[PDB]
């Protein structure tokens, strides 16, 4: 049956992407937190 | 509000008299429409001269 993840690149990059993170103060805090943890993947 | 009369107006006083009015009466009608000045020394000197 239909499952929860239905991938779409535009939708992924528009809800979770780098510019979407940088558009908000809270998204920039997400990025600051990911960089402080040292993640090799900042954004999808 | 203390103000110097710049002209005769009823029930308030003569020309040049320093009278007491309600602040709304002085601030909203008389001074803006040039019937009086605020009572300061720099204004009483201007009028007296």
């Amino acid at each position: 049956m239909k499952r929860t993840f239905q991938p779409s690149v535009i939708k992924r990059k528009r809800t979770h992407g780098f510019r979407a993170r940088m558009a908000t103060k809270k998204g920039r805090q997400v990025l600051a937190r990911r960089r402080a943890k040292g993640r090799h993947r900042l954004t999808v | 509000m203390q103000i110097i009369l710049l002209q005769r107006i009823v029930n308030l006083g003569k020309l040049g008299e320093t009278v007491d009015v309600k602040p709304g009466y002085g601030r909203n009608f008389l001074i803006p429409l040039g019937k009086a000045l605020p009572a300061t020394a720099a204004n009483i000197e201007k009028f007296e001269a």
Binding site: - | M1, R27, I31, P32, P38, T40
Partner: protein
């Protein structure tokens, strides 16, 4: 924002206190009003968002004194 320009009055925080002494956070807002002040020195009306205390300060000090203080303060 809801800030008086000439006096600096802005909202205060405090408590609503019930008769049973229950505390709730509340605000205390300034008595802010729009007023067009006549300025003879510029022959014009300038509209300020001002508190009642600021209007009294206009009454005592003069619109010219208050206006030069605002201009020194910044926004004009």
């Amino acid at each position: 924002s809801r800030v008086c320009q000439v006096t600096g009055k802005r909202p205060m925080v405090g408590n609503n206190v019930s008769h049973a002494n229950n505390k709730t956070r509340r605000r205390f807002l300034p008595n802010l009003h729009h007023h067009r002040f006549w300025v003879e020195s510029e022959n014009r009306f300038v509209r300020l968002r001002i508190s009642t205390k600021g209007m009294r300060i206009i009454d005592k000090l003069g619109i010219d004194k208050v206006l030069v203080d605002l201009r020194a303060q910044g926004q004009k």
